[PDB]
Amino acid sequence: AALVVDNGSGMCKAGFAGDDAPRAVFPSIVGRPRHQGVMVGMGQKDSYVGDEAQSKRGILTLKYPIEHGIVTNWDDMEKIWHHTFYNELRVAPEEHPVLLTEAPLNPKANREKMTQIMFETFNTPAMYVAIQAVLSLYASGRTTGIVMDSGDGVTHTVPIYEGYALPHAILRLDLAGRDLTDYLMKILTERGYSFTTTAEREIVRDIKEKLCYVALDFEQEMATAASSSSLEKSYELPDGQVITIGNERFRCPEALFQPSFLGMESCGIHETTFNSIMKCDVDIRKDLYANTVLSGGTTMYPGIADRMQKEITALAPSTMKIKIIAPPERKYSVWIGGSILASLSTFQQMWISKQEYDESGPSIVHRKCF
Amino acid sequence: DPKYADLPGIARNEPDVYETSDLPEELTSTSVEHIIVNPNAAYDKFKDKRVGTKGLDFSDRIGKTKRTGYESGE
């Protein structure tokens, strides 16, 4: 009996260890109303969470507590965990031990405060933090190979050989799904369709998920998109109003491969994977080329694998064979790894108990990382 | 002055600028021996020193046994 709770900046995937899919999946967001001194009606909650905040977008100011995979507002983060445990899962944190997920090369303060809250506030019997990239290997049952776990906050590439990580080869990029949404809003406004407010930002994100796809040849696709109006598709808003996205449809995801558009002054996601392999040992490079895994929900763009294959192949040697591993279920690949690891009898020893926390302190999390 | 004197929508008898008040080790270690560099003295010491550059070739050529560049200062 154990709980797996992924602390994603976009979506919170929670469930019991051994389960195939997460039980409770909701957006990690807090919505507080823009209330004036004028009297309000009955059934009014001071702060809404998840589906409720998504339903009442009109009045509620939506503030993500996690910014670039870092918890900015810890008080709101506790309210997300409180809704997750008590309301969504319908389980006491005192009963089951909780498996948590961290991004690589995160600030040390996150682990320190994380463990304090779970043991002190929630009084959990045990808590273990795991690397998202390491868990995704358990989902694929592969000890060797690199993973490109691209989230809403950040994107990172962690190469692991025969279940041994190369810490020097780990690369972190702040470019992620949330930055793409803000880019799409700007270029849609230039077309004519203006989106300013927090509620409108969420509507544009829902539009992005439906229409946007990755082009194989960016210049040729834009040249063809300029010529013909076959790619131009219509989208119906919550209001009767209908919009035509046009050439901007496939323009948004290009920023991942060419960050110069957003102005990141960094290398593309395909260059990050290649650069990481170059930092890795010469012998194991062959196996990393053979096992390039794509993880997270930011790699669910249609035809991203086709563009990735072309770009990596160009960078890689001509003699070398480059194989990209893109399973249908990438979105829940990190959580499934957590469920498999938590289910494994070996992991039973890895749990940090309340007694161990009290004796050692919050510094115990830093010792039992890797 | 006459330019904005004619115009109606101009600031008159107001301050132009709104601004805030103007607000006004290893080389000294004991373990290492500290040397003062005097290039004039160094030149005088090495001034009359010469080298023999005849037959000079530092390169990784195998032929003709071992070589030592700069034979003498004769």
């Binding site: 004036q36 230039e190 | 330019k3 600031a11 301050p15 601004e19």
Partner: protein, 370 residues
């Protein structure tokens, strides 16, 4: 053609016309068309059904005001063509659009269709020899006579902050908010109705604007002026009737610095300035704080600079010199900038000929914009 260029400031409130040789804009009139309130089918009534500038001022009570431009965007193009035809009339300037070139002042981050359609009018409706659209923020710096400087241009339709260093405009740090002078007049009309003075007619909206322009002071401490009993300063209407403004005078513009009070989802005028500087590189941030320039008409409010300096100082880093160098002619700065730019020999290369527009197409205006 060698003939002097005609500068036209595309202000949502008042259009400012004149030649590049002129030191000041000679012709400044409200940017709206006045039509009779009653729909006139019979003869012996007001003929033409178009009153612009002083003609509208003469028959103000009889006519109904409709602004063709909202938040720096043209809604009714037919009305705007009549206004631009009035710019090239016998009444104002009295010159041929075929002889003299034109310099336009388009707001930043507008839809591409608005820019393309605006250009089409001056080439198709008007047979202009040459046309050049320029950036409002850049022109303000030519007027002031400095290359480096932050330009906080608070207009009637739009408020935007552009940081420019050594004649380089950072496109990523630019911030635009729709809450401008026009909204304060709308909010004051609401507050005046809360005082017990109704302004039902569109003509009475101009009297709310007149009250704001005459009597509107920004308090340093709003709680002391709210607690203190007001003098209740009377304003005299053209008819002779008096209005007691009272606390509505100073507690109306508060929404510029605190728009969350009424319930408008925006940062605020003091916030947009600070954030725009924070986006820039660490090396330039200190120079941008030491060089701030106020532009637009919504800076003429009594005690604006005093309140702004205090609000910026609290947000800005400690022990940093903050110099807000306001000119006396903030309202007319943008047009003077255009006159200077047009006067420069570099402009000769900048503008696009009518013949080039006929051959190249519409795209021409986008490539030469920057």
């Amino acid at each position: 053609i060698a003939n002097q260029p005609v500068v036209i400031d595309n202000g949502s409130g008042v259009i400012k016309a004149g030649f590049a040789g002129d030191q000041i804009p000679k012709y400044c009139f409200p940017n709206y068309v006045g039509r009779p309130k009653h729909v006139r089918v019979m003869a012996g009534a007001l003929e033409g059904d178009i009153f612009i500038g002083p003609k509208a001022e003469e028959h103000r009570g009889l006519l109904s005001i409709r602004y063709p431009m909202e938040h720096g965007i043209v809604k009714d193009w037919n009305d705007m063509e009549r206004i631009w035809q009035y710019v090239y009339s016998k009444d104002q300037l009295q010159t041929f659009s075929e002889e003299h070139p034109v310099l336009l002042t388009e707001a930043p981050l507008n839809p591409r269709k608005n820019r393309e359609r605006a250009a089409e009018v001056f080439f198709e409706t008007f047979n202009v020899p040459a046309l050049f659209i320029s950036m409002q923020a850049v022109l303000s710096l030519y007027a002031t006579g400095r290359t480096t400087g932050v330009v906080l241009d608070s207009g009637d339709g739009v408020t935007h902050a552009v940081p420019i260093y050594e004649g380089f405009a950072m496109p990523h740090s630019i911030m635009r908010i729709d809450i401008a002078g026009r909204d304060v007049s709308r909010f004051l009309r609401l507050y005046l109705r809360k005082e017990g003075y109704d302004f039902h007619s569109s003509s009475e909206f101009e009297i709310v604007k007149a009250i704001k322009e005459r009597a509107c002071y920004l308090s340093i401490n709003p709680q002391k002026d709210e607690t203190l009993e007001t003098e209740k300063a009377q304003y005299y209407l053209p008819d002779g009737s008096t209005i007691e403004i009272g606390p509505s005078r100073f507690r109306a513009p508060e929404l510029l610095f605190r728009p969350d009070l009424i319930g408008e989802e925006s940062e605020g005028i003091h916030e947009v300035l600070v954030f725009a500087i924070q986006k820039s590189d660490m090396d330039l941030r200190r120079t941008l704080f030491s060089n701030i320039v106020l532009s637009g008409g919504s800076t003429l409010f009594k005690g604006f600079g005093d309140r702004l300096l205090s609000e910026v100082k609290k947000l800005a880093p400690k022990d940093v010199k903050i110099r807000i160098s306001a000119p006396q002619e903030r309202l007319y700065s943008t047009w003077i900038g255009g006159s200077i730019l047009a006067s420069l020999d570099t402009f000769k290369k900048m503008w696009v000929s009518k013949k080039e527009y006929e051959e190249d197409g519409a795209r021409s205006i986008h490539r030469k914009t920057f």
